[PDB]
């Protein structure tokens, strides 16, 4: 029903940046993130 | 009290407890009889009321009497009521108080008086005699009704003279029977009242409504100066609690709508997400109808 | 309909008594039986007939084991020697064959 | 054309269900209470002699009072005789069951007895539904015995002034005669004797209370204990009634009890724990529904209601109303299903709404044939209609489809 | 089931009568009303 | 003990639908205390006063 109804009829970029500076820093070394996780 | 394990038929459990109850009546003592309980429990205490009097005019032993023998059989009728139950008040009691000085004076034993009592409160009928052309039914009076009728209970009688009446060996006074339950309102007035007990598994709310209704019908019938102050109404919570969950459902709808609305910046699709909800309920409520589930904080939850 | 009869004899007792002491304490205590529609009952010369009609589609035998439990609750109340006796497994429509 | 439906509609009548014909009918007559058992038997004989007099009756098994069964509560003088019928085929094709019935009506007579003729399978079903033995029956409730007796008495009168009605009777609760034995407690004490053992001379002597039972194997016969008929002949005979005091005194009954005739309850009917009083109406030529309307109005105007006293039409009509309601709102259903299922075929409300339109012409056609055949609007016809719509819409689908 | 009348045909007639008669006025009229209001419909 | 000392109901007045108990008891005075019961008067079947 929803596909038929969907067929018939900014903050986000800042959102993205926010998560995408910490994302590459996490790959810097995964282990530590997991250590952090366990912690 | 016999508690049964999860998910057993409330009525099987009874026809069950009934067979066994039969097996045991022989064992247990002479005159005693084990009597089955009502079709409910303590949780079924749905609606309650006190029977107050604004004039001091009405007797507290007269008030329960009005309840036990009128209000009871008007409320018992009601659809899903397992039983309306009197609470407090005072039971009228014809209490004969024996005087020992009067028992030795006439040398009359108690077992005699007691037997004289048992045999002075009945009626009987001797079939039908055809007088005129029609058959006449034949009743013969005999019930204790007047306090006077108690006083002339023939005990000992002498050929050619005066009979000794119960009055000649005891004062017979209408008195309050020993209580086993005292009902009381605030600190203002000790009162008689009743409780409406719901049959297990029925709708308290609806029964309450029907109770209120029948009670407004019966107000025109009670003496002057008696008001029915309701003590416990269970329907209050029902309402308070049922609305609470209806509030959230709406609160959430708006919330989620506005959230989806914000993110999409497109009203149509913001609503396409939205419309998933109205239909959500409709499907949810259709299934409920079938399994046999109803609205309540828990299922609405 | 699914109907269950309670017959009770109160040997030699006016109707206005049978009703007060037997037919009425019985009719009122029977309307509150699960699945009961109406309760026709009338007192006689020394007899008491109470008829318990049940609402559409109720088990003819549940209605009986039902009317039986309650019948137990009432035997204590009603008069001394009297005993409310359950009716047959049928009704007036069950009058199939007859003979003289 | 749809308009022409209004003339036939005004000629047809309304019944609950048709008159299904079984080759037996029981004659039940609303009969009054003060009578003896012998007087009941002689009536039972005489009646059946005439029930059996009519050419087409076959057997006649009369009955008064109850057969040994809780199913039957019938008191004496409540006649309930089963009439058996020789196959109607054998009668010369010159009459119906209604003439059969009509002859019976004129043949049996006997006032004090309002005679009613009903069919056995139907009467017992009607009975454990509403309580009324006749198809038409008014049912007056209330809490005050004598009041709802008045209403009954009035409606009894007003009811027979209606055309269709033949015999309209209303049973009076407060109308039964007693012999009252007011036992004076004082007068008892003097003679050293208790209200209990005074009643023994009333219960056994005057009456005939069974003091026990002879046992003969499986068999079991009662043991009576009574004074001879001579001291129990009349009220006066009882005033004389001899009694032997525990002190060996010889006294009459009028000595320890004043005895006075009186009236009161004959039988106490309580439907749903509220006193009821009834009225049996009998009409067999007129239309079932119509009569109730003439009665209904003949009562609303010429008979005002007392307090705490309500009247209601019962029996076959009462069962017709529960139907009608459910029956009537069946068309919104049927139509929606018919419209909806058509809406499916062509996806356009156009040809579906037109083809649906086929039925209002059906109704007219059938409702007319109803007139031609002197048939009545019954829960039967209503079923023929709800079936008609199905095929009527079928014909509308083929002309459209092709 | 409308004509023949033995035992029980009383009730079956009352449900056969409406259907029969009604199954004339509908089919008959449909023949003339369905081309009429239909031509008048499309255009 | 049962009726005098206590108040056992020796039966019941019947008033239509209604039904009220019938007591049978000694006055409060002989049932006040243990000692009051030690005194409790009794009339023997041989008409003795004990």
mmCIF file of N, CA and C in Angstrom, chain B residues 73-74 77 116 119-131 133-145 148-150 152-154 156-165 167, chain D residues 33-37 39 176-186 188-197 199 202-204 206-208 232-235 238 247 249 261-262 265-266 272-273:
data_model
loop_
_atom_site.group_PDB
_atom_site.id
_atom_site.type_symbol
_atom_site.label_atom_id
_atom_site.label_comp_id
_atom_site.label_asym_id
_atom_site.label_seq_id
_atom_site.Cartn_x
_atom_site.Cartn_y
_atom_site.Cartn_z
ATOM 1 N N UNK B 73 -32.346 -6.682 45.034
ATOM 2 C CA UNK B 73 -33.046 -7.389 43.967
ATOM 3 C C UNK B 73 -33.342 -6.498 42.765
ATOM 4 N N UNK B 74 -33.044 -5.212 42.899
ATOM 5 C CA UNK B 74 -33.153 -4.283 41.781
ATOM 6 C C UNK B 74 -31.827 -4.209 41.031
ATOM 7 N N UNK B 77 -30.612 -7.932 39.282
ATOM 8 C CA UNK B 77 -31.138 -8.076 37.931
ATOM 9 C C UNK B 77 -30.081 -7.737 36.889
ATOM 10 N N UNK B 116 -41.856 -24.891 71.600
ATOM 11 C CA UNK B 116 -43.068 -24.087 71.515
ATOM 12 C C UNK B 116 -42.888 -22.992 70.466
ATOM 13 N N UNK B 119 -42.950 -24.283 66.541
ATOM 14 C CA UNK B 119 -44.262 -24.719 66.074
ATOM 15 C C UNK B 119 -45.308 -23.606 66.016
ATOM 16 N N UNK B 120 -44.869 -22.352 66.046
ATOM 17 C CA UNK B 120 -45.812 -21.240 66.092
ATOM 18 C C UNK B 120 -45.551 -20.181 65.033
ATOM 19 N N UNK B 121 -45.110 -20.613 63.857
ATOM 20 C CA UNK B 121 -44.745 -19.690 62.790
ATOM 21 C C UNK B 121 -44.895 -20.333 61.411
ATOM 22 N N UNK B 122 -46.085 -20.843 61.093
ATOM 23 C CA UNK B 122 -46.299 -21.492 59.795
ATOM 24 C C UNK B 122 -47.673 -21.256 59.163
ATOM 25 N N UNK B 123 -47.848 -21.813 57.966
ATOM 26 C CA UNK B 123 -49.143 -21.887 57.298
ATOM 27 C C UNK B 123 -49.297 -23.286 56.708
ATOM 28 N N UNK B 124 -50.530 -23.668 56.393
ATOM 29 C CA UNK B 124 -50.806 -24.977 55.807
ATOM 30 C C UNK B 124 -52.134 -24.948 55.060
ATOM 31 N N UNK B 125 -52.320 -25.884 54.135
ATOM 32 C CA UNK B 125 -53.513 -25.895 53.309
ATOM 33 C C UNK B 125 -54.147 -27.261 53.159
ATOM 34 N N UNK B 126 -55.465 -27.314 53.327
ATOM 35 C CA UNK B 126 -56.201 -28.560 53.232
ATOM 36 C C UNK B 126 -57.006 -28.706 51.953
ATOM 37 N N UNK B 127 -56.321 -28.623 50.817
ATOM 38 C CA UNK B 127 -56.935 -28.867 49.514
ATOM 39 C C UNK B 127 -58.060 -27.886 49.187
ATOM 40 N N UNK B 128 -59.110 -28.392 48.545
ATOM 41 C CA UNK B 128 -60.182 -27.539 48.040
ATOM 42 C C UNK B 128 -61.580 -28.107 48.277
ATOM 43 N N UNK B 129 -62.414 -27.334 48.964
ATOM 44 C CA UNK B 129 -63.810 -27.698 49.166
ATOM 45 C C UNK B 129 -64.693 -26.923 48.193
ATOM 46 N N UNK B 130 -65.587 -27.632 47.515
ATOM 47 C CA UNK B 130 -66.458 -27.008 46.527
ATOM 48 C C UNK B 130 -67.705 -26.402 47.161
ATOM 49 N N UNK B 131 -67.623 -25.129 47.534
ATOM 50 C CA UNK B 131 -68.793 -24.417 48.026
ATOM 51 C C UNK B 131 -69.330 -23.569 46.882
ATOM 52 N N UNK B 133 -70.557 -23.070 43.493
ATOM 53 C CA UNK B 133 -70.273 -23.906 42.336
ATOM 54 C C UNK B 133 -68.766 -24.051 42.149
ATOM 55 N N UNK B 134 -68.017 -23.134 42.751
ATOM 56 C CA UNK B 134 -66.575 -23.059 42.549
ATOM 57 C C UNK B 134 -65.781 -23.761 43.646
ATOM 58 N N UNK B 135 -64.568 -24.176 43.295
ATOM 59 C CA UNK B 135 -63.647 -24.789 44.242
ATOM 60 C C UNK B 135 -62.905 -23.714 45.024
ATOM 61 N N UNK B 136 -62.939 -23.819 46.347
ATOM 62 C CA UNK B 136 -62.268 -22.851 47.205
ATOM 63 C C UNK B 136 -60.929 -23.361 47.729
ATOM 64 N N UNK B 137 -59.884 -22.579 47.489
ATOM 65 C CA UNK B 137 -58.569 -22.869 48.038
ATOM 66 C C UNK B 137 -58.630 -22.531 49.523
ATOM 67 N N UNK B 138 -57.946 -23.308 50.356
ATOM 68 C CA UNK B 138 -58.051 -23.106 51.801
ATOM 69 C C UNK B 138 -56.723 -22.866 52.523
ATOM 70 N N UNK B 139 -56.414 -21.592 52.752
ATOM 71 C CA UNK B 139 -55.243 -21.204 53.532
ATOM 72 C C UNK B 139 -55.632 -21.109 55.001
ATOM 73 N N UNK B 140 -54.651 -21.263 55.885
ATOM 74 C CA UNK B 140 -54.873 -21.096 57.316
ATOM 75 C C UNK B 140 -53.738 -20.287 57.936
ATOM 76 N N UNK B 141 -54.065 -19.097 58.433
ATOM 77 C CA UNK B 141 -53.069 -18.186 58.998
ATOM 78 C C UNK B 141 -52.166 -18.870 60.024
ATOM 79 N N UNK B 142 -51.036 -18.242 60.344
ATOM 80 C CA UNK B 142 -50.145 -18.791 61.352
ATOM 81 C C UNK B 142 -48.795 -18.123 61.564
ATOM 82 N N UNK B 143 -48.427 -17.182 60.704
ATOM 83 C CA UNK B 143 -47.111 -16.555 60.814
ATOM 84 C C UNK B 143 -46.961 -15.585 61.986
ATOM 85 N N UNK B 144 -45.803 -15.635 62.641
ATOM 86 C CA UNK B 144 -45.403 -14.580 63.564
ATOM 87 C C UNK B 144 -45.212 -13.305 62.756
ATOM 88 N N UNK B 145 -45.999 -12.281 63.061
ATOM 89 C CA UNK B 145 -45.883 -11.008 62.362
ATOM 90 C C UNK B 145 -45.935 -9.839 63.336
ATOM 91 N N UNK B 148 -46.924 -8.906 69.229
ATOM 92 C CA UNK B 148 -47.948 -9.474 70.095
ATOM 93 C C UNK B 148 -48.016 -10.986 69.913
ATOM 94 N N UNK B 149 -47.906 -11.433 68.665
ATOM 95 C CA UNK B 149 -47.992 -12.855 68.343
ATOM 96 C C UNK B 149 -46.896 -13.669 69.026
ATOM 97 N N UNK B 150 -45.773 -13.021 69.322
ATOM 98 C CA UNK B 150 -44.695 -13.664 70.063
ATOM 99 C C UNK B 150 -45.086 -13.813 71.529
ATOM 100 N N UNK B 152 -47.968 -14.266 72.916
ATOM 101 C CA UNK B 152 -49.004 -15.254 73.203
ATOM 102 C C UNK B 152 -48.639 -16.657 72.720
ATOM 103 N N UNK B 153 -47.341 -16.940 72.684
ATOM 104 C CA UNK B 153 -46.857 -18.284 72.400
ATOM 105 C C UNK B 153 -47.194 -19.193 73.571
ATOM 106 N N UNK B 154 -48.223 -20.017 73.407
ATOM 107 C CA UNK B 154 -48.683 -20.883 74.488
ATOM 108 C C UNK B 154 -47.596 -21.849 74.951
ATOM 109 N N UNK B 156 -47.419 -23.354 78.784
ATOM 110 C CA UNK B 156 -48.111 -24.303 79.643
ATOM 111 C C UNK B 156 -49.547 -23.851 79.863
ATOM 112 N N UNK B 157 -50.495 -24.759 79.671
ATOM 113 C CA UNK B 157 -51.906 -24.405 79.793
ATOM 114 C C UNK B 157 -52.656 -25.352 80.725
ATOM 115 N N UNK B 158 -53.482 -24.779 81.593
ATOM 116 C CA UNK B 158 -54.244 -25.561 82.547
ATOM 117 C C UNK B 158 -55.701 -25.690 82.120
ATOM 118 N N UNK B 159 -56.167 -26.930 82.002
ATOM 119 C CA UNK B 159 -57.572 -27.214 81.737
ATOM 120 C C UNK B 159 -58.424 -26.380 82.678
ATOM 121 N N UNK B 160 -59.446 -25.731 82.129
ATOM 122 C CA UNK B 160 -60.325 -24.860 82.912
ATOM 123 C C UNK B 160 -59.642 -23.594 83.437
ATOM 124 N N UNK B 161 -58.785 -22.967 82.632
ATOM 125 C CA UNK B 161 -58.155 -21.726 83.059
ATOM 126 C C UNK B 161 -56.955 -21.155 82.315
ATOM 127 N N UNK B 162 -56.402 -20.094 82.899
ATOM 128 C CA UNK B 162 -55.278 -19.344 82.344
ATOM 129 C C UNK B 162 -54.167 -20.190 81.717
ATOM 130 N N UNK B 163 -53.700 -19.784 80.524
ATOM 131 C CA UNK B 163 -52.512 -20.362 79.896
ATOM 132 C C UNK B 163 -51.289 -19.504 80.186
ATOM 133 N N UNK B 164 -50.130 -20.134 80.325
ATOM 134 C CA UNK B 164 -48.876 -19.407 80.466
ATOM 135 C C UNK B 164 -48.326 -19.080 79.084
ATOM 136 N N UNK B 165 -48.189 -17.794 78.791
ATOM 137 C CA UNK B 165 -47.655 -17.377 77.504
ATOM 138 C C UNK B 165 -46.159 -17.128 77.599
ATOM 139 N N UNK B 167 -44.832 -14.537 77.042
ATOM 140 C CA UNK B 167 -44.751 -13.233 77.691
ATOM 141 C C UNK B 167 -44.644 -13.389 79.203
ATOM 142 N N UNK D 33 -60.836 -20.166 36.172
ATOM 143 C CA UNK D 33 -60.446 -20.961 37.384
ATOM 144 C C UNK D 33 -61.357 -21.650 38.469
ATOM 145 N N UNK D 34 -62.357 -20.995 39.045
ATOM 146 C CA UNK D 34 -63.274 -21.736 39.903
ATOM 147 C C UNK D 34 -64.094 -22.887 39.343
ATOM 148 N N UNK D 35 -63.512 -24.085 39.320
ATOM 149 C CA UNK D 35 -64.250 -25.292 38.943
ATOM 150 C C UNK D 35 -63.694 -26.530 39.652
ATOM 151 N N UNK D 36 -64.437 -27.633 39.589
ATOM 152 C CA UNK D 36 -64.007 -28.893 40.195
ATOM 153 C C UNK D 36 -63.462 -29.855 39.140
ATOM 154 N N UNK D 37 -62.890 -30.969 39.591
ATOM 155 C CA UNK D 37 -62.268 -31.938 38.689
ATOM 156 C C UNK D 37 -63.293 -32.701 37.849
ATOM 157 N N UNK D 39 -66.330 -31.609 37.033
ATOM 158 C CA UNK D 39 -66.872 -30.635 36.095
ATOM 159 C C UNK D 39 -65.896 -30.409 34.946
ATOM 160 N N UNK D 176 -59.133 -15.173 42.655
ATOM 161 C CA UNK D 176 -59.219 -16.552 43.103
ATOM 162 C C UNK D 176 -59.761 -16.627 44.519
ATOM 163 N N UNK D 177 -60.731 -17.508 44.748
ATOM 164 C CA UNK D 177 -61.437 -17.538 46.028
ATOM 165 C C UNK D 177 -60.816 -18.483 47.054
ATOM 166 N N UNK D 178 -60.663 -17.989 48.279
ATOM 167 C CA UNK D 178 -60.125 -18.778 49.381
ATOM 168 C C UNK D 178 -61.178 -19.046 50.452
ATOM 169 N N UNK D 179 -60.864 -19.987 51.338
ATOM 170 C CA UNK D 179 -61.554 -20.125 52.613
ATOM 171 C C UNK D 179 -60.515 -19.836 53.684
ATOM 172 N N UNK D 180 -60.638 -18.685 54.336
ATOM 173 C CA UNK D 180 -59.637 -18.254 55.305
ATOM 174 C C UNK D 180 -59.855 -18.793 56.715
ATOM 175 N N UNK D 181 -58.831 -19.459 57.243
ATOM 176 C CA UNK D 181 -58.865 -19.982 58.603
ATOM 177 C C UNK D 181 -57.967 -19.148 59.511
ATOM 178 N N UNK D 182 -58.490 -18.014 59.966
ATOM 179 C CA UNK D 182 -57.742 -17.122 60.839
ATOM 180 C C UNK D 182 -57.664 -17.717 62.237
ATOM 181 N N UNK D 183 -56.555 -18.393 62.527
ATOM 182 C CA UNK D 183 -56.375 -19.067 63.809
ATOM 183 C C UNK D 183 -56.039 -18.094 64.934
ATOM 184 N N UNK D 184 -57.003 -17.880 65.822
ATOM 185 C CA UNK D 184 -56.822 -16.995 66.966
ATOM 186 C C UNK D 184 -55.873 -17.616 67.987
ATOM 187 N N UNK D 185 -54.697 -17.015 68.151
ATOM 188 C CA UNK D 185 -53.678 -17.562 69.043
ATOM 189 C C UNK D 185 -54.149 -17.680 70.489
ATOM 190 N N UNK D 186 -54.853 -16.663 70.973
ATOM 191 C CA UNK D 186 -55.381 -16.693 72.332
ATOM 192 C C UNK D 186 -56.316 -17.879 72.527
ATOM 193 N N UNK D 188 -56.360 -20.498 71.164
ATOM 194 C CA UNK D 188 -55.567 -21.721 71.136
ATOM 195 C C UNK D 188 -54.941 -21.998 72.497
ATOM 196 N N UNK D 189 -54.325 -20.972 73.073
ATOM 197 C CA UNK D 189 -53.646 -21.108 74.356
ATOM 198 C C UNK D 189 -54.562 -21.690 75.425
ATOM 199 N N UNK D 190 -55.773 -21.148 75.518
ATOM 200 C CA UNK D 190 -56.745 -21.602 76.505
ATOM 201 C C UNK D 190 -56.833 -23.123 76.546
ATOM 202 N N UNK D 191 -56.972 -23.731 75.374
ATOM 203 C CA UNK D 191 -57.162 -25.172 75.273
ATOM 204 C C UNK D 191 -55.831 -25.914 75.190
ATOM 205 N N UNK D 192 -54.761 -25.267 75.645
ATOM 206 C CA UNK D 192 -53.434 -25.858 75.618
ATOM 207 C C UNK D 192 -53.139 -26.564 74.311
ATOM 208 N N UNK D 193 -52.912 -25.783 73.260
ATOM 209 C CA UNK D 193 -52.776 -26.330 71.916
ATOM 210 C C UNK D 193 -52.147 -25.301 70.979
ATOM 211 N N UNK D 194 -51.277 -25.773 70.095
ATOM 212 C CA UNK D 194 -50.431 -24.893 69.297
ATOM 213 C C UNK D 194 -50.919 -24.696 67.856
ATOM 214 N N UNK D 195 -50.676 -23.502 67.317
ATOM 215 C CA UNK D 195 -51.013 -23.184 65.934
ATOM 216 C C UNK D 195 -50.601 -24.302 64.985
ATOM 217 N N UNK D 196 -49.529 -25.003 65.335
ATOM 218 C CA UNK D 196 -49.079 -26.140 64.546
ATOM 219 C C UNK D 196 -50.136 -27.239 64.539
ATOM 220 N N UNK D 197 -50.380 -27.841 65.700
ATOM 221 C CA UNK D 197 -51.290 -28.984 65.785
ATOM 222 C C UNK D 197 -52.771 -28.621 65.674
ATOM 223 N N UNK D 199 -53.407 -26.870 62.816
ATOM 224 C CA UNK D 199 -53.306 -27.011 61.367
ATOM 225 C C UNK D 199 -53.354 -28.463 60.909
ATOM 226 N N UNK D 202 -56.496 -29.217 59.789
ATOM 227 C CA UNK D 202 -56.721 -28.498 58.540
ATOM 228 C C UNK D 202 -56.024 -29.206 57.384
ATOM 229 N N UNK D 203 -54.771 -29.580 57.610
ATOM 230 C CA UNK D 203 -53.937 -30.186 56.578
ATOM 231 C C UNK D 203 -54.425 -31.574 56.162
ATOM 232 N N UNK D 204 -54.622 -32.446 57.145
ATOM 233 C CA UNK D 204 -54.961 -33.838 56.872
ATOM 234 C C UNK D 204 -56.471 -34.067 56.841
ATOM 235 N N UNK D 206 -59.233 -31.834 56.970
ATOM 236 C CA UNK D 206 -59.899 -30.995 55.980
ATOM 237 C C UNK D 206 -59.385 -31.281 54.575
ATOM 238 N N UNK D 207 -58.069 -31.358 54.437
ATOM 239 C CA UNK D 207 -57.472 -31.595 53.140
ATOM 240 C C UNK D 207 -57.431 -33.056 52.751
ATOM 241 N N UNK D 208 -56.264 -33.656 52.933
ATOM 242 C CA UNK D 208 -56.015 -35.016 52.506
ATOM 243 C C UNK D 208 -54.528 -35.174 52.290
ATOM 244 N N UNK D 232 -66.144 -31.711 55.649
ATOM 245 C CA UNK D 232 -65.401 -30.829 54.760
ATOM 246 C C UNK D 232 -66.238 -30.451 53.548
ATOM 247 N N UNK D 233 -67.532 -30.237 53.752
ATOM 248 C CA UNK D 233 -68.420 -29.908 52.642
ATOM 249 C C UNK D 233 -68.454 -28.416 52.326
ATOM 250 N N UNK D 234 -68.493 -27.589 53.365
ATOM 251 C CA UNK D 234 -68.599 -26.148 53.176
ATOM 252 C C UNK D 234 -67.887 -25.389 54.292
ATOM 253 N N UNK D 235 -67.777 -24.059 54.145
ATOM 254 C CA UNK D 235 -67.242 -23.218 55.219
ATOM 255 C C UNK D 235 -67.909 -23.553 56.545
ATOM 256 N N UNK D 238 -66.884 -26.598 58.172
ATOM 257 C CA UNK D 238 -65.587 -26.467 58.833
ATOM 258 C C UNK D 238 -65.691 -25.749 60.176
ATOM 259 N N UNK D 247 -55.496 -32.080 76.038
ATOM 260 C CA UNK D 247 -55.995 -32.317 77.386
ATOM 261 C C UNK D 247 -57.291 -33.117 77.308
ATOM 262 N N UNK D 249 -59.983 -32.525 75.304
ATOM 263 C CA UNK D 249 -61.162 -31.675 75.229
ATOM 264 C C UNK D 249 -61.817 -31.811 73.855
ATOM 265 N N UNK D 261 -64.653 -16.525 54.237
ATOM 266 C CA UNK D 261 -64.401 -16.598 52.803
ATOM 267 C C UNK D 261 -63.726 -15.319 52.333
ATOM 268 N N UNK D 262 -62.989 -15.402 51.230
ATOM 269 C CA UNK D 262 -62.354 -14.222 50.647
ATOM 270 C C UNK D 262 -61.800 -14.495 49.253
ATOM 271 N N UNK D 265 -54.979 -13.778 44.961
ATOM 272 C CA UNK D 265 -54.209 -14.356 43.855
ATOM 273 C C UNK D 265 -54.708 -15.738 43.436
ATOM 274 N N UNK D 266 -54.887 -15.939 42.134
ATOM 275 C CA UNK D 266 -55.235 -17.250 41.599
ATOM 276 C C UNK D 266 -53.953 -17.961 41.178
ATOM 277 N N UNK D 272 -39.473 -12.096 34.372
ATOM 278 C CA UNK D 272 -38.298 -11.293 34.695
ATOM 279 C C UNK D 272 -38.394 -10.642 36.071
ATOM 280 N N UNK D 273 -38.963 -11.373 37.025
ATOM 281 C CA UNK D 273 -39.033 -10.926 38.414
ATOM 282 C C UNK D 273 -39.964 -9.734 38.621
#
